[PDB]
Design a protein around this ligand. Sequence first.
Ligand SMILES: *[C@@H]1O[C@H](CO)[C@@H](O)[C@H](O)[C@H]1NC(C)=O
Lengths: 48, 48, 48
Amino acid sequence: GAISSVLNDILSRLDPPEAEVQIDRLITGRLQSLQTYVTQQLIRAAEI
Amino acid sequence: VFNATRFASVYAWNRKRISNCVADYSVLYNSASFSTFKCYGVSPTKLN
Amino acid sequence: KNKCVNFNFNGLTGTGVLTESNKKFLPFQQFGRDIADTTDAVRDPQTL
Ligand SMILES: *[C@@H]1O[C@H](CO)[C@@H](O)[C@H](O)[C@H]1NC(C)=O
């Protein structure tokens, strides 16, 4: 939902008040991606 | 585009394609000649 | 070259070491991408 997938583009294109919203969107998405990856890895490592 | 003698009616809004040049937006942003200067998806200071 | 710098090519920001590469860019190709879909190799805007 952010304007760009690249963090540096948002940082170089927006003022801090709106860069905060866009970076918050990206942080939410990427942190959920790591949460998913770590959970799958824990289950797979239990199997291994 | 800014200082043209006449502007077209909105139903036949004029379009000018600016390309192959160097744009100095500072003179646009520091001028007090505009009542509404709202950049969307980008920041006015970052334009340079 | 060969120094960790904050480079900015045509608004493309980044941080890395720029080295003389042997990639076979076609005359129209600007810059390369890796599997991660991030900038990987570029063309100098003043020198092809
Ligand atoms: C300007 O850029 C062109 C790239 O085609 C290069 O050949 C030329 O030497 C450059 N001149 C200056 C003064 O930077």
